Design a protein around this nucleic acid. Structure first.
Ligand SMILES: [K+]
Ligand SMILES: [K+]
Ligand SMILES: [K+]
Ligand SMILES: [K+]
Ligand SMILES: [K+]
Ligand SMILES: [K+]
Ligand SMILES: [K+]
Ligand SMILES: [K+]
Ligand SMILES: [K+]
Ligand SMILES: [K+]
Ligand SMILES: [K+]
Ligand SMILES: [K+]
Ligand SMILES: [K+]
Ligand SMILES: [K+]
Ligand SMILES: [K+]
Ligand SMILES: [K+]
Ligand SMILES: [K+]
Ligand SMILES: [K+]
Ligand SMILES: [Mg+2]
Ligand SMILES: [Mg+2]
Ligand SMILES: [Mg+2]
Ligand SMILES: [Mg+2]
Ligand SMILES: [Mg+2]
Ligand SMILES: [Mg+2]
Ligand SMILES: [Mg+2]
Ligand SMILES: [Mg+2]
Ligand SMILES: [Mg+2]
Ligand SMILES: [Mg+2]
Ligand SMILES: [Mg+2]
Ligand SMILES: [Mg+2]
Ligand SMILES: [Mg+2]
Ligand SMILES: [Mg+2]
Ligand SMILES: [Mg+2]
Ligand SMILES: [Mg+2]
Ligand SMILES: [Mg+2]
Ligand SMILES: [Mg+2]
Ligand SMILES: [Mg+2]
Ligand SMILES: [Mg+2]
Ligand SMILES: [Mg+2]
Ligand SMILES: [Mg+2]
Ligand SMILES: [Mg+2]
Ligand SMILES: [Mg+2]
Ligand SMILES: [Mg+2]
Ligand SMILES: [Mg+2]
Ligand SMILES: [Mg+2]
Ligand SMILES: [Mg+2]
Ligand SMILES: [Mg+2]
Ligand SMILES: [Mg+2]
Ligand SMILES: [Mg+2]
Ligand SMILES: [Mg+2]
Ligand SMILES: [Mg+2]
Ligand SMILES: [Mg+2]
Ligand SMILES: [Mg+2]
Ligand SMILES: [Mg+2]
Ligand SMILES: [Mg+2]
Ligand SMILES: [Mg+2]
Ligand SMILES: [Mg+2]
Ligand SMILES: [Mg+2]
Ligand SMILES: [Mg+2]
Ligand SMILES: [Mg+2]
Ligand SMILES: [Mg+2]
Ligand SMILES: [Mg+2]
Ligand SMILES: [Mg+2]
Ligand SMILES: [Mg+2]
Ligand SMILES: [Mg+2]
Ligand SMILES: [Mg+2]
Ligand SMILES: [Mg+2]
Ligand SMILES: [Mg+2]
Ligand SMILES: [Mg+2]
Ligand SMILES: [Mg+2]
Ligand SMILES: [Mg+2]
Ligand SMILES: [Mg+2]
Ligand SMILES: [Mg+2]
Ligand SMILES: [Mg+2]
Lengths: 77, 93, 93, 45, 60
RNA sequence: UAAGGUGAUAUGAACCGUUAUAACCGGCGAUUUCCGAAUGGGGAAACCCAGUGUGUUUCGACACACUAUCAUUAACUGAAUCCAUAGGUUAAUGAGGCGAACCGGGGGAACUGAAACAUCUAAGUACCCCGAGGAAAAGAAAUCAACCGAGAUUCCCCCAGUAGCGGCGAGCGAACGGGGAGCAGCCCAGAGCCUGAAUCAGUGUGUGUGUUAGUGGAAGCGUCUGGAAAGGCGCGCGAUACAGGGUGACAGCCCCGUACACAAAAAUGCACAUGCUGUGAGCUCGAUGAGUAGGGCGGGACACGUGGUAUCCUGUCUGAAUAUGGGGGGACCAUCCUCCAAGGCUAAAUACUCCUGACUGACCGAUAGUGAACCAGUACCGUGAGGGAAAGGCGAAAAGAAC
RNA sequence: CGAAGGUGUGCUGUGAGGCAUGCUGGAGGUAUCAGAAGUGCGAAUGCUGACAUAAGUAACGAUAAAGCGGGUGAAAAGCCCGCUCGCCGGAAGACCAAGGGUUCCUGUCCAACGUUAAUCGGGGCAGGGUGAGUCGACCCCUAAGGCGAGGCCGAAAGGCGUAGUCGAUGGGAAACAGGUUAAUAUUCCUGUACUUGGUGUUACUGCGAAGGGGGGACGGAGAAGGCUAUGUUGGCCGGGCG
RNA sequence: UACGGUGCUGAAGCAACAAAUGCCCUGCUUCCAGGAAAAGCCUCUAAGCAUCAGGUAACAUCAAAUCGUACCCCAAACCGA
């Protein structure tokens, strides 16, 4: 599914609104990218499907802290 | 417990045989009794046979031979065991 | 080898009919009603043990029960198993 | 003339039988509805 | 007859069980032939088998 | 608990029992085929076919048990690849499926109304999906208020069809504040001193108190009509019992009950009591939730349709100060007041009834009331989902009509 | 010592109505004054049930066709038996699959069912009847296709698919003739066979798969030769002399 | 004969000719549109076992379960009330 493994961002629903205010249902998808993250503690690459936002979280917190959070949830990688 | 029992002498309170006496031959689970010589019917048996029809148990009373009248039954415990007694004179049946 | 408990439940009844009587006189074959789940091996063992005869062969069939009206309501008799048990020549059950 | 019902027990059972009903959520909902209604015969089986 | 059967051992109860099952077989054959007037014996033996099996299970 | 009994249509047969192992009722056990989550593999449900281990064999075979999947944990093992990791096998523990409503969440119509119709409405309704519990959710102020003060959440009555929103149309529609129901507060983000004091869970065991069978339970006769009396007439009696039902017509006193008084070997809910097991309170000193608040863009939620639009949520791009600090007070600024987000738990008042017991009705009485008073979700119809009836009354007693 | 309801009759009010009473009925009814409504039916091509009309009318379902004698019976155009006639005969015969499920056979019954009668029936009731190493299924094997551990994907539900595992309409061992029941028969019996596997006894001996190879293993059309099923005729045998 | 059907016994039982759309034939000839799969089966060895198991043939013996089997089936029994 289109779910960020770091943040849990997923598709949300809302409306397209025309100039005449016609509402049609749409989705907003996360900006997801499969990315190979270097885990220097483990000396290997871990691939995560992450939002661009999730990538900024990894930059801020570090991959070790993030993977520990994933292990606590039971999110496997 | 049942106030009327098989082999009790009873007197008929109600119906065509009111006042007649007889022995309880059989007690039915329907709340009826066969009383000997009471409530006779002529059955057309595939001969014409005379036999007792069941009577409502509330239409017979225990017959008190001492007073010579219909009586009511009560229950009490004498020496551990439950006994029946005549309400009129308090004597164990 | 079959346990005696099992053998005492497999044979249900002798089957009585003109075909059964003829089977006995002409072909030395007894016809039995047997348990629905009885095998030819179990029937053979049970006959040899309990009737004290020597069995040549067992043929079996399942009789499908008849659909029958009792008053208005529809019912169905049970299926049952018939065994044609051929005895050896000089057994004489 | 050839009418619409051309019976085949194999096709009957594969299309509508108990195991066909059990194979999908929507088939299991059929069985749930029929049990709730109190049907004597849940399926064609 | 559970009080009497409870005095026995597993060996004796197993002996008693086969005796009852043999009796049950013989009565069944008599009943099928129409030489059993006493139909009440069928229930008696059936319930006796149940008693022995109950007590064997209790001791097991 | 008992003098009767072996469920019904449904008689019979063959029996069992009467002072206690007949039957019946209740507690606790035993047994509990096959299908079905169905779980050893398969399968057109109620069937077909195995493996492994044990035990027993009359050598033909037989019996019993285990063997699904996923998750977590552990052990043994183990690639590309050196270490390793992936992977493999076994073990333990848990899950799975079903269920009427209520509850939280993920999605989410249209008819319709606007006397057309697109904004708007219907409506976050119907419906689909996920998850839970006896309730759920919410909850201990970055809340309101207005310079006076209040003091978590929830529910009810007001405020008020008001203020507002609105093709300012149709419609939508608060809050502040007041009256009530109920009431309760805590913990982590951490070291120290100190003992394990507070109190919540699992497992006990006495003490009550209910639940699951039961026990006793008052007092009426005569006469008239009649097929029959419980009715009429006469004269009595009980009542902490004249609730109700039955009995050959309408019975306080014929029967079953009722008021009232009692009862449990066994299992069990609850409430306190004191153990054991884990849990640690108190105090001083310190700490105080960042890709967050806020912003830009798009949308959604707020009664509030972008409007002069505060506040909340966030798909996307960004991005603080962190108590000498920060949030809010309906554009915005200043002043003043008030609160402390980015961690969490928490009873009660509230919602509902598949189901169990008791009781009630200016509710129905067989075309009514459930579709169904009756062997009805049946017969019957349909490939299927699904649809779906009709049909009650002899008599007091079968005395159901011998001949 | 006769309630409601039903059905008559009489009286009565301006009306909706009311009162009385005979018969039926056989256990309920309810003044008055108030109170509440599922409160009044002729229509809605209204709804359900009952019953009319047309009408003893149309029709009795292939124009293959009947006739007679005897039987049984309450009764015979229809059943049974017989003789004759007619109809089908690449079927209107015979055997099956599919589908149905006792309709099969025997006895008994004729209400209903059978477009008539019915003694008859696929109708009612009862009893009987389906016998396998070799036929088929199950089973081994796969096709299309289905499901699918992990996996990849998807708001949820789910979608796809690997290893696998299912799935015949296809591939895979073996039985024939005769006889027999009211009703089964390549299943029973008689005679004569065959297949696969397990165990043991003897002999000789490289056996061993989840792998390799072979095989299984495949089209349309056409042509002709060799055959058999089968038929015809003769011979033979039995019977015939119209 | 219980007139439905049984019992008893039983001769000849050969040849010629004709002849399939059936068999030889999953053949042969020919054509283009170029005609399943997998197992059983045969054979080869690997790891392995190694004078043991296993293989091969004859001989003997045991096993071959379970379910279907009635009846209609171009039809009065199936699909069409
Ligand atoms: K609309
Ligand atoms: K309109
Ligand atoms: K009286
Ligand atoms: K009475
Ligand atoms: K009473
Ligand atoms: K932001
Ligand atoms: K401030
Ligand atoms: K109805
Ligand atoms: K009247
Ligand atoms: K009144
Ligand atoms: K009308
Ligand atoms: K007419
Ligand atoms: K006629
Ligand atoms: K077979
Ligand atoms: K099988
Ligand atoms: K002539
Ligand atoms: K057959
Ligand atoms: K067929
Ligand atoms: Mg819309
Ligand atoms: Mg045989
Ligand atoms: Mg068979
Ligand atoms: Mg399974
Ligand atoms: Mg299984
Ligand atoms: Mg399998
Ligand atoms: Mg409109
Ligand atoms: Mg619960
Ligand atoms: Mg909660
Ligand atoms: Mg202040
Ligand atoms: Mg009592
Ligand atoms: Mg009393
Ligand atoms: Mg009466
Ligand atoms: Mg904070
Ligand atoms: Mg804010
Ligand atoms: Mg923001
Ligand atoms: Mg803003
Ligand atoms: Mg914005
Ligand atoms: Mg918006
Ligand atoms: Mg505006
Ligand atoms: Mg502000
Ligand atoms: Mg927030
Ligand atoms: Mg009704
Ligand atoms: Mg009526
Ligand atoms: Mg049907
Ligand atoms: Mg009655
Ligand atoms: Mg009335
Ligand atoms: Mg009148
Ligand atoms: Mg009305
Ligand atoms: Mg009318
Ligand atoms: Mg009108
Ligand atoms: Mg008409
Ligand atoms: Mg006319
Ligand atoms: Mg005419
Ligand atoms: Mg005519
Ligand atoms: Mg005709
Ligand atoms: Mg004639
Ligand atoms: Mg004719
Ligand atoms: Mg004829
Ligand atoms: Mg029938
Ligand atoms: Mg017939
Ligand atoms: Mg007729
Ligand atoms: Mg007639
Ligand atoms: Mg018939
Ligand atoms: Mg075969
Ligand atoms: Mg496939
Ligand atoms: Mg798939
Ligand atoms: Mg999966
Ligand atoms: Mg397969
Ligand atoms: Mg096939
Ligand atoms: Mg036949
Ligand atoms: Mg060809
Ligand atoms: Mg020839
Ligand atoms: Mg001659
Ligand atoms: Mg041809
Ligand atoms: Mg046949």
């Amino acid at each position: 599914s289109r779910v960020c493994q770091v943040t849990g961002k997923r598709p949300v629903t809302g409306n397209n609104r025309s100039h005449a205010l016609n509402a049609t249902k749409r989705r907003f998808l996360p900006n997801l990218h499969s990315h190979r993250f270097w885990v220097e503690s483990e000396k290997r690459f871990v691939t995560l499907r992450v939002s661009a936002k999730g990538m900024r979280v990894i930059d801020k917190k570090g991959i070790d802290t993030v993977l520990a959070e994933l292990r606590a949830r039971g999110e496997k990688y | 417990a049942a106030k009327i029992r098989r082999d009790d002498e009873v007197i008929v309170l109600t119906g065509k045989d009111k006042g007649k006496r007889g022995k309880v031959k059989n007690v039915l689970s329907s709340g009826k009794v066969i009383v000997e010589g009471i409530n006779l019917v002529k059955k057309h048996q595939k001969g014409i046979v005379e036999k007792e029809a069941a009577i409502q148990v509330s239409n017979v009373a225990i017959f008190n031979a001492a007073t010579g009248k219909a009586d009511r039954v009560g229950f009490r415990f004498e020496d551990g065991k439950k006994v029946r007694f005549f309400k009129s004179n308090s004597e164990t049946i | 080898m079959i346990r005696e408990e099992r053998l005492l439940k497999v044979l249900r009844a002798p089957h009585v009919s003109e075909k059964a009587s003829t089977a006995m006189e002409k072909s030395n074959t007894i016809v039995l009603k047997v348990a629905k789940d009885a095998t030819k091996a179990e029937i053979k063992a049970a006959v040899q043990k309990l009737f004290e005869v020597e069995v040549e062969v067992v043929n079996t069939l399942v009789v499908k029960g008849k659909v029958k009206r009792h008053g208005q309501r529809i019912g169905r008799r049970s299926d049952w198993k018939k065994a044609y048990v051929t005895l050896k020549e000089g057994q004489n059950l | 003339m050839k009418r619409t019902f051309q019976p085949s027990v194999l096709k009957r059972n594969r299309s509508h039988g108990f195991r066909a009903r059990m194979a999908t959520k929507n088939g299991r909902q059929v069985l749930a509805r029929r049990r709730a209604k109190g049907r004597a015969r849940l399926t064609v089986s | 007859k559970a009080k009497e059967l409870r005095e026995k051992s597993v060996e004796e109860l197993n002996t008693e069980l086969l005796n009852l099952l043999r009796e049950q077989f013989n009565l069944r054959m008599q009943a099928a032939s129409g030489q059993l007037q006493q139909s009440h014996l069928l229930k008696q033996v059936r319930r006796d088998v149940a008693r022995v099996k109950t007590l064997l299970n209790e001791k097991a």
